[PDB]
């Protein structure tokens, strides 16, 4: 129950898999696809890419990013990323997933973001809990993107 703050924001959705291997402390995130993204270019669509942050206690510990897909609101990525998180800390971290529009000049604006892990709620918490309940098993799930203002207030 609960969560769902981004549902009516109409920013789009992201699908990714999570896998956690406790013995090795290996956390794998595969960015699969996004859909229904907000348009971010005047006269056009968006040039989306995805950033992943590992966080704890308001600090960005590690940063990864996908390739950029041009001129689409429904990008497919299928790009894998791994992090090292010891089992004693896996219930105390966040994985933050942000979709942004690439612009050749100017700060790349976020479309929206979500996080899973500590302090996550709703479908975000469910995905994380499913990951932890099933060591070594990759679990794919869709998430609704939420405005950065809101998500960042929860992460800070």
**Residues at the interface with Ca ion (CB under 5 A):** 40-41, 47, 101, 103
Quote the tokens at residue 130: 């499913």
Q: Residue 2 or 106: which CB sits closer to Ca ion?
A: 106
Listed in sequence order, the residues at least 6 apart from 45 whose beta carbon sits closer than 8 Å to its beta carbon are 39, 71, 72, 73
CA distances from 22 to 83, 109, 138 (A): 12, 35, 13
Least CB distance from residue 38 to Ca ion, whole Å? 10
**Residues tagged in the binding site annotation for Ca(2+):** 41, 47, 101, 103, 109
Q: Residue 73 or 132: which CB sits closer to Ca ion?
A: 73
Q: Residue 73 or 140: which CB sits closer to Ca ion?
A: 73
CA distances from 86 to 94, 137, 149 (A): 13, 17, 30
**Residues tagged in the binding site annotation:** 41, 47, 101, 103, 109
Q: Which residue is nearest to Ca ion (CB)?
A: 47
């Amino acid at each position: 129950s609960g969560g769902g703050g981004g549902i009516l924001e109409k920013l789009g959705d992201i699908c990714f898999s999570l896998r956690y291997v406790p013995t090795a402390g290996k956390l794998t995130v595969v960015i699969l696809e996004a859909k229904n993204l907000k348009k971010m270019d005047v006269g056009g669509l968006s040039d989306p890419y995805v950033k992943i942050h590992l966080m704890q206690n308001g600090k960005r510990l590690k940063k990864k990013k996908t390739t950029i897909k041009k001129n689409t609101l429904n990008p497919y990525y299928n790009e894998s990323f791994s992090f090292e998180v010891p089992f004693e800390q896996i219930q105390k971290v966040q994985v933050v997933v942000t979709v942004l529009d690439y612009d050749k000049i100017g700060k790349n604006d976020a479309i929206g973001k979500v996080f899973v892990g500590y302090n996550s709620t709703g479908a975000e918490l469910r995905h994380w809990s499913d990951m932890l309940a099933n060591p070594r098993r990759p679990i794919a799930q869709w998430h609704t993107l939420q405005v950065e203002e809101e998500v960042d207030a929860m992460l800070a």
